Amino acid sequence: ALDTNYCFSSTEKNCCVRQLYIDFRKDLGWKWIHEPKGYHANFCLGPCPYIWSLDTQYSKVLALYNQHNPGASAAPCCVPQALEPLPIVYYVGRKPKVEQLSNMIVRSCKCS
Amino acid sequence: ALDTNYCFSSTEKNCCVRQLYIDFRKDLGWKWIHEPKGYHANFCLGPCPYIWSLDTQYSKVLALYNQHNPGASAAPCCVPQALEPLPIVYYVGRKPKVEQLSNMIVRSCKCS
């Protein structure tokens, strides 16, 4: 349950959902969307120690390796698990159209 | 095609598969396997700039954000894509058994 619900509810040094806002024009150079002018994408940050949402088998061994070998580089990394859509409005000429952009918001992270 | 084939033929500063050997007894404390005594698991390390194997839409967006905002933290991370099994032998009493442990070798990485 490494979601925005848990992670935002606390400070948390391990892998977790972090606040992030993106301006469509300032950050992507997307000049074509009408609303919103940007959105809260969030991102995944934090170390992946053993027990901490190691889902795959390889994660477990890899995390475990890292314990018995601290300064290693080799470690599971914190990445998104659940992604959610973002509804927007853009004009095509002066007809407005609503599209739903898939997987734009991270709601939860994992270690991989 | 960020696989061992590509990744090992050269050095590569971006997200790519990196060599790693894991000793069952020394690194995991596993005293129950007979063969092998260890194996080459490998791992995923390296930066994820734009274009560099960005799979989900969010990854692309995140990478694009990072172009317009260089030292940003918010960035796709190098993680495995393809995992391959490892065949092993362990004793049960003195009868030997042949098992396939799933997803134990990383063959390729991606940016997420």
Q: Encoding tokens for residue B108?
A: 């390729």
For an interface test with A, which of B17, B43, B73 has the most A Cβ atoms less than 10 Å from its Cβ? B43
Q: Is B61 helix (H, G, I), strand (E, B) or coil?
A: helix
Residues of chain A with C-beta less than 8 angstroms from the C-beta of B73 = 43, 45
* φ, ψ for residue B87, nearest 5 deg: -80, 140
Amino acid at A37: K
Closest CA to B70 of B54, B47, B52: B47
Contacting residues of B for A102, CB less than 8 Å apart:
57
Which technique? Answer: X-ray
Contact residues, chain A to chain B, C-beta under 8 Å: 18, 20, 22, 26-29, 41, 43-45, 56-58, 61-62, 64-65, 68-69, 73-75, 77-80, 83, 101-106, 112
Instruction: State how far the Cα of B15 lies from the Cα of B112, in Å rounded to an integer.
Output: 11
One-letter identity of residue B64:
L
Please give the domain boundaries of chain B with CATH numbers for all domains: 1-112 (2.10.90.10)
Q: A64, B43 in Cβ contact below 8 A?
A: no
Query: Tokens 């000429």 — which residue?
Result: A93
CA distance linking residue A48 with residue A54, whole number of Å:
8
DSSP designation for A27: I
Q: Are A87 and A54 in contact (CB under 8 A)?
A: no
C-alpha separations of B38 from A38, A70, B35 in Å = 50, 19, 8
- DSSP H helical ranges for chain A: 4-8, 57-67
| E-assigned strand segments in A1-111 | 16-18, 21-23, 33-35, 38-40, 43-45, 78-92, 95-111
Pairwise CB contact (< 8 Å): A74 & B18: yes
In a mutagenesis test of the B interface, which of A25, A79, A109 is the best target, namely the one with the most B β-carbons within 10 Å? A79
Q: Are A81 and A108 in contact (CB under 8 A)?
A: yes
Query: Interface of chain B against chain A, CB under 8 Å?
Result: 18, 20, 22, 26-29, 41, 43-45, 56-58, 61-62, 64-65, 68-69, 73-80, 83, 101-106, 112
Do the beta carbons of residue A112 and residue A55 sit within 8 Å? Answer: yes
Percent of residues in chain A assigned helix, strand, coil, to nearest 5: 20, 45, 40
